[PDB]
Design a protein around this ligand. Structure first.
Ligand SMILES: *[C@@H]1O[C@H](CO)[C@@H](O[C@@H]2O[C@H](CO)[C@@H](O[C@@H]3O[C@H](CO[C@@H]4O[C@H](CO[C@@H]5O[C@H](CO)[C@@H](O)[C@H](O)[C@@H]5O)[C@@H](O)[C@H](O)[C@@H]4O)[C@@H](O)[C@H](O)[C@@H]3O)[C@H](O)[C@H]2NC(C)=O)[C@H](O)[C@H]1NC(C)=O
Ligand SMILES: *[C@@H]1O[C@H](CO)[C@@H](O[C@@H]2O[C@H](CO)[C@@H](O[C@@H]3O[C@H](CO[C@@H]4O[C@H](CO)[C@@H](O)[C@H](O)[C@@H]4O)[C@@H](O)[C@H](O)[C@@H]3O)[C@H](O)[C@H]2NC(C)=O)[C@H](O)[C@H]1NC(C)=O
Ligand SMILES: *[C@H]1O[C@H](CO)[C@@H](O[C@@H]2O[C@H](CO)[C@@H](O[C@@H]3O[C@H](CO[C@@H]4O[C@H](CO)[C@@H](O)[C@H](O)[C@@H]4O)[C@@H](O)[C@H](O)[C@@H]3O)[C@H](O)[C@H]2NC(C)=O)[C@H](O)[C@H]1NC(C)=O
Ligand SMILES: OC[C@H]1O[C@H](O)[C@@H](O)[C@@H](O)[C@@H]1O
Lengths: 48, 638, 285, 215
């Protein structure tokens, strides 16, 4: 029952690696949404 | 029987210096003391240093200042304090807070237009309000709670002041914006300040709505009288016409009163409007019911030129049967059986502001009386019997001009101090409560209560000072056999601000070779002001009002070595929004809320006195305090 | 700006900490001036009226005022390049007087309206050069581009979900206007699932003081050892008693020491070594 | 314009010349400028107790309190001004001598009246402290105190302060009206039978100054 707590998951796995390729294409874009932070709402703005 | 005790703050803090009072009773010669702190559970050794020796020349009192590093959910984390007095080891577990300090955000204006720039500074200080260099994360959210900009600057060598700025795009949603900042070492603790974004234009005059009374008496025939004062920004009086309306509020819902709409002229920059009780009652469909609700006035002044227009509003006008309110929030909930119990009556107006000069008394004792001071606190004192039965007290306002029906009453219940093994040994601390001011001296009274069979054993009291959640000072008060009352000349400095506590206890052997500890705490309020001083007046010690474009000297009287940040804003801006400003009073209000003490004083027992004052007692004899494992104070259970 | 300023000061001393000074107000006024009041924004080509209030705060001297609206190619009023649109009104003492002005914005952008006025006989004057934003004919709106779910593990199979995003058609966008596109990424985490452990509140007996011989000592040390190991991984020491753990560690260490007094060169030392007991010692240790 | 060696002067004209053996004795230091006008904000202390301090109020009176031993030997006190910016040579000092309260037939029965001395103002209330001092053998006999009020040379008021056996300190809620102006005295005494069937009377008086303003 103790080990059952250590190997406990909690149902999660937020390892998302989203990339954005807009016509502004002069460099690159990559934002990672890992656990802890996760909920962190990452945003990008383009005047075009 | 050498008794080694230890006292630490009820809740420890990270990246901050927390004091730790070491002691040794009935000890001979010197004694090597080694203080150590480990994580819980297990052993990781967060701090092993800090060792001292208790010299008989200091009455065997130690003093070790330690600091808990970082080296980083939902469940609180604890630490294990371990003090080894030569060979005998005494340890105690204490709760830890992730709060590293406070953050104050300041914006130049209160409202901004789409296209302008927002200038905001972030003040970084610790629990002692002293500047500190840390890493701060600052975000800016829109009305719909969506971050748009995030920075990560450091107040390192910046003297705890982080100047920042952000340009508001033309294309953006209007409403209430928020700026959220937090230390990198504590993401859970976030500070925020709001600034409104709206397409506006600075008016040329302000409008004030002041009701004759800061409340409304339901049985008042005259009705709610309101005065409409309107004057230009430059001071000159305003001539125009105002449109005033009323309404009732209920928690969050408002009910407008169309039949109360008035159109009064504004001559000499003043206006007079009255809300007859007739219309008020007709607004609903049981006068005693409206009791508790609030009234709000909404005025709208328009110049005789029809060029400018201003909308004012007064909200929160209480509807009560009594012009006063009584609170026992500053009175200890525990009395000493057969000893003078002090009652700190806190009389306040229906709005919340303290009431000055309002006589009060107890249920009985028609002769007993006491007026209220400038702080809103009255001084009462009653004699209790040696009965272990709860003491019920009902305080009644006795202000003339009114009737026994218009008076406000409140009742509390105090519990006797449970003594160790029913030995009937008590300790009372009576304080001459007056508006304490940094520089004066306080006469701390120590009243002992025990049979003479063991009174000769008591020779000293161990008192500690609580301030902003830390141990300010701790000493000893000598006592000779046969003395029931001894005074402690406690000088008040600029540190005691705002409020400071004072716990005092004594330990001895009696009854039947059993160790006993008796304590008593007291909470005193000191005048709320700046730790130092900062004044800004006109350099010109003469002359009148300046002229647009003209220069003027600006004298600034502050503390030496201190950095001062300035900002000037047109008063017209505050006419549209005066909320979310930065005031010294709002700072102390936050500091007080972060206090670890949850009792005006005293406790159920000796282990309760310390805990209810934000402290932890642990000895080699076994006498310890109640385990605290909850961050916040007790959920205010009315 | 002819008004009252409010100066706020904040001192940050490393000795006296932070301190917010009391706001200091400075009144800046003039016996005679103009309060040109312009709306926040005016629509291009739309004819609107702007107010120009002339204040006179002299004791008992009504002022003979001459007010003029300077010409500007950006606006269309009675005042032209060769014609001056100037009135000559009079203002009573300790009062004000509004002066109408019809204008028509011609070009967008932060334009400039300027009015001047001087009094006869008295040598006083005051001009005001404020600026008002001139916006074309359009209305705020926030059309939704698209709203889809991102999950490679589920959507698109493969392992690298791709997503085509059409631009905003806005077939009805007023020419010569800017427009920003905002991308929002949000994690939709779903926790849960953890079958509770032992109440522990009614389990205060495993703290048995180890004693006896070789095996008798182990049977008494078993409960205490596994108890602490369980309370540590369940952090239930709060509901059990934090100050009780120290009393447990001592009993565990005490059981370890007593077990050393039965360590043969390899129960009773007089007895032959046991295979199971030795194997169990390793398990607990 | 006075030519003196110290910018201040100390007077014990407002301090009782008699102390209660083993009881807190109050010292009303009266600091004044060389001309005669009271000196505002001037710290003072006693010969010993380097830690003890007290500033002077607007009236020119400082609040001091010391603990005495159960010795029937005269108490000598030397008060020393402790205003900074100056030196121990520019300070003004004064010494007085207080005598123990002779108890009837040397029964060692005393009574002390400690008053929270602040600028009293007509309308406020004063906490009059009654501190008893006698063996428990006869303490149960005392059940009330008889206090009298002196004002402008006449008896303003007189009442009784109840006391239960075992109480060494009882407070008297004395409301201050517009009659107490300027200064009013307060004498308190108790009478009982003890020692050897001998009648004994013990008293203690105190002089308090009320704000000087129009009635
Ligand atoms: C020393 O001597 C003094 C003078 O005798 C005493 O002063 C009086 O004490 C009382 C209590 O402190 C004073 O205060 C109050 O008086 C008012 C009422 O106004 C009074 O009317 C009184 C009564 O006359 C009648 O009484 C009978 C019985 O009830 C009724 O049938 C009748 O209808 C009428 O009421 C007068 O005697 C009285 O003094 C006032 O004229 C009262 O509301 C309070 O409850 C209280 O009694 C009283 O005013 C004093 N007398 C004065 C100032 O003239 C004092 O008690 C005593 N002690 C010392 C040492 O001071
Ligand atoms: C995207 O488009 C939407 C739709 O235009 C925009 O939503 C609108 O935005 C503003 C600001 O968020 C909202 O103003 C609020 O209005 C609420 C609710 O409306 C009220 O309705 C009740 C019941 O009828 C009554 O109180 C009134 O009738 C009132 O109108 C109000 O309570 C608040 O005070 C607040 O001002 C507005 O509601 C909303 N309009 C909608 C949803 O149709 C949105 O701003 C825009 N931006 C983005 C990117 O989301
Ligand atoms: C627990 O310990 C603390 C820390 O010792 C004590 O608090 C008080 O701390 C101040 C520190 O500023 C002490 O007074 C200071 O004296 C220094 C001069 O340095 C010292 O001088 C003395 C005299 O020769 C020496 O003994 C020292 O070794 C050193 O040289 C001065 O610069 C400061 O302005 C200040 O005056 C003070 O000793 C101490 N107060 C006391 C005695 O109680 C204190 O013991 C106790 N504090 C708490 C929180 O209870
Ligand atoms: O004795 C005075 C006291 O009782 C009487 C009342 O009329 C008041 O004057 C006061 O409350």
């Amino acid at each position: 029952l103790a080990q059952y707590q250590k190997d406990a998951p909690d149902h999660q796995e937020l390892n998302l690696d989203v990339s954005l390729q807009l016509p502004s294409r002069s460099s690159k874009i990559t934002h990672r949404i890992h656990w802890e932070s996760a909920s962190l709402l990452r945003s990008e703005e383009t005047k075009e | 029987s050498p008794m080694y005790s230890i006292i630490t703050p009820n809740i420890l803090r990270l990246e901050s210096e927390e004091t730790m009072v070491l002691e040794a009773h009935d000890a001979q010669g010197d004694v090597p003391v080694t203080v150590t702190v480990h994580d819980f559970p297990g052993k990781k050794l967060v701090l092993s240093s800090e060792k001292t020796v208790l010299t008989p020349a200091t009455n065997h009192m130690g003093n070790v200042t330690f600091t808990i590093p970082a080296n980083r959910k939902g469940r609180n984390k604890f630490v294990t304090v371990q003090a080894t007095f030569g060979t005998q080891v005494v340890e105690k577990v204490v709760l830890v807070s992730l709060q590293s300090g406070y953050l104050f955000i300041q914006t130049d204006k209160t409202i901004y237009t789409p296209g302008s720039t927002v200038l905001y500074r972030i003040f970084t200080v610790n629990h002692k309000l002293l500047p500190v260099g840390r890493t701060v994360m600052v975000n800016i959210e829109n009305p719909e709670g969506i971050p748009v900009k995030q920075d990560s600057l450091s107040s390192q060598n910046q003297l705890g002041v982080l100047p920042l700025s952000w340009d508001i795009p033309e294309l953006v949603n209007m409403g209430q914006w928020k700026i959220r900042a937090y230390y990198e070492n504590s993401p859970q603790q976030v500070f925020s300040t709001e600034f409104e974004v709206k397409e506006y234009v600075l008016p040329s005059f302000e409008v004030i709505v002041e009701p004759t009374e800061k409340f409304y008496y339901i049985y008042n025939e005259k009705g709610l009288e309101v005065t409409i004062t309107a004057r230009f920004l430059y001071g000159k009086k305003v001539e125009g016409t105002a449109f005033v309306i009323f309404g009732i509020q209920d928690g969050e819902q408002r009910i407008s009163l169309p039949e109360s709409l008035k159109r009064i002229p504004i001559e000499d920059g003043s206006g007079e409007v009255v809300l007859s009780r007739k219309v008020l009652l007709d607004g609903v469909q049981r006068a005693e019911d409206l009791v508790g609700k609030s009234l709000y006035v909404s005025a709208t002044v328009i110049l005789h030129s029809g060029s400018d227009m201003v909308q004012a509003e007064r909200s929160g006008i209480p509807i009560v049967t009594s012009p006063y309110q009584i609170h026992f929030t500053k009175t200890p909930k525990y009395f000493k059986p057969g000893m003078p119990f002090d009652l700190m009556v806190f009389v306040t107006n229906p709005d919340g502001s303290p009431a000055y000069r309002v006589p009060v008394a107890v249920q009985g004792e028609d002769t007993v009386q006491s007026l209220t001071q400038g702080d809103g606190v009255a001084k009462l004192s009653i004699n209790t019997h040696p009965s272990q039965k709860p003491l019920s007290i009902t305080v009644r306002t006795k202000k003339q001009e009114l009737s026994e029906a218009e008076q406000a009453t409140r009742t509390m219940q105090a519990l006797p101090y449970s003594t160790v093994g029913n030995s009937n040994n008590y300790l009372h601390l009576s304080v001459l409560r007056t508006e304490l001011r940094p520089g004066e001296t306080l006469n701390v009274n120590f009243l002992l209560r025990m049979d003479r069979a063991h009174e000769a054993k008591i020779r000293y009291y161990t008192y500690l000072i609580m301030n902003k959640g830390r141990l300010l000072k701790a000493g000893r008060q000598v006592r000779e056999p046969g003395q029931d009352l001894v005074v402690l000349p406690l000088s008040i400095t600029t540190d005691f601000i705002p409020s400071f506590r004072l716990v005092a206890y004594y330990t001895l052997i009696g009854a039947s070779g059993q160790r006993e500890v008796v304590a008593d705490s007291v909470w005193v309020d000191v005048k709320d002001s700046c730790v130092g001083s900062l004044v800004v007046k006109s350099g010109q010690s003469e002359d009148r009002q300046p002229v647009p474009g003209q220069q003027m000297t600006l004298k600034i009287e502050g503390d030496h070595g201190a950095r001062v940040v300035l900002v000037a804003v047109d008063k017209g801006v505050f006419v549209l929004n005066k909320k979310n400003k930065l005031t010294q009073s709002k700072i102390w209000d936050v500091v007080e809320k972060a206090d670890i003490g949850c009792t005006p004083g005293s406790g159920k027992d000796y282990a309760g006195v310390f805990s209810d004052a934000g402290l932890t007692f642990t000895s080699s004899s076994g006498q310890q305090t109640a385990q605290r494992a909850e961050l916040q104070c007790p959920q205010p259970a009315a | 700006s002819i008004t009252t300023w409010e100066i706020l000061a904040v001192s940050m001393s490393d000795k006296k900490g932070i301190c917010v000074a009391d706001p200091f107000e400075v009144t800046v006024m003039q016996d005679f001036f103009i309060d040109l009041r312009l709306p926040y924004s005016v629509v291009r080509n739309e004819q609107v009226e702007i107010r120009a209030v002339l204040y006179n705060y002299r004791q008992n001297q009504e002022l003979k005022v001459r007010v003029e609206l300077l010409h500007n190619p950006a606006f269309c009023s009675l005042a032209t390049t060769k014609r001056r649109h100037q009135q000559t009104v009079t203002i009573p003492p300790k009062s004000s007087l509004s002066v109408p002005y019809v204008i028509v914005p011609l070009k967008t952008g932060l334009q400039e309206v300027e009015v001047k006025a001087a009094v006869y006989h008295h040598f006083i004057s005051d001009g005001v050069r404020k600026s008002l934003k001139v916006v074309p004919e359009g209305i705020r709106m926030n059309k939704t581009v698209a709203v889809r779910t991102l999950d490679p593990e589920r959507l698109g199979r493969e392992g690298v979900q791709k997503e085509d995003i059409p631009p905003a058609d806005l077939s009805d966008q007023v020419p010569d206007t800017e427009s920003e596109t905002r991308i929002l990424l949000q994690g939709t985490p779903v926790a849960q699932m953890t079958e509770d452990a032992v109440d522990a509140e009614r389990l205060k007996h495993l703290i048995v003081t180890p004693s006896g011989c070789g095996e008798q000592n182990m049977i008494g040390m078993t409960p205490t050892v596994i108890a602490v190991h369980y309370l540590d991984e369940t952090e239930q020491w709060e509901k059990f008693g934090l100050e009780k753990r120290q009393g447990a560690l001592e009993l565990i260490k005490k059981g370890y020491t007593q077990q050393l007094a039965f360590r043969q060169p390899s129960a009773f030392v007089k007895r032959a070594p046991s295979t199971w007991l030795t194997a169990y010692v390793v398990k607990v240790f």
